Amino acid sequence: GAMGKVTHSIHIEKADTYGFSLSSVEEIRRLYVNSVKETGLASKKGLKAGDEILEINNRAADALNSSMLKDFLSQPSLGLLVRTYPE
Amino acid sequence: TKQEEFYA
Ligand SMILES: *S(=O)(=O)c1cccc2c(N(C)C)cccc12
Ligand SMILES: [Cl-]
Ligand SMILES: [Cl-]
Ligand code: NA
Numbered sequence: 001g002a003m004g005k006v007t008h009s010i011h012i013e014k015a016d017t018y019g020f021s022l023s024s025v026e027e028i029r030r031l032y033v034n035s036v037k038e039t040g041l042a043s044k045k046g047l048k049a050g051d052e053i054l055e056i057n058n059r060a061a062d063a064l065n066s067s068m069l070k071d072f073l074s075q076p077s078l079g080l081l082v083r084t085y086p087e
Numbered sequence: 088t089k090q091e092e093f094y095a
Contacts, residue, residue, distance in 0.1 A: 017095065024091040034092065042095075066091060073095040 001086030007054065008084045010045045014076045018042050022053065022073075024066075031061050033082070051082040 012018050019040020023032050031053035036043050054061050056072050057079045064072075072078065 020095055022093045022095060023089055024093070025089055027088070029090075069093065073093055078095075 008082050010080045012078045051084050055081040
């Protein structure tokens with residue numbers, strides 16, 4: 001594989017969790033997947049650790065508050081667009 | 088610099 005950008009559109013639905021952790025970072029704020037629970041709902045959808053979250057529920061990552069972010073991760077349904085790297 | 092970690 002090479003250096004072209006590949007992105008992956010994911011929809012997850014559910015007491016239950018989605019089963020991934022996500023780090024908020026700056027350097028340029030960014031949202032990265034740290035880990036994905038083996039056998040969890042995000043894993044069956046092909047979410048991978050190190051994916052970068054670009055959009056959540058049709059909103060750009062940059063434009064997301066800790067507040068929209070808390071609210072989005074708590075809802076029963078979750079739409080993500082992620083950048084995914086070759087393996 | 089890590090600001091927050093969410094366990095979703
Ligand atoms: S910070 O300078 O420690 C920093 C900057 C960018 C990303 C970071 C990560 N990501 C999970 C890659 C972890 C810890 C610090 C950090
Ligand atoms: Cl390379
Ligand atoms: Cl894990
Ligand atoms: Na590369």
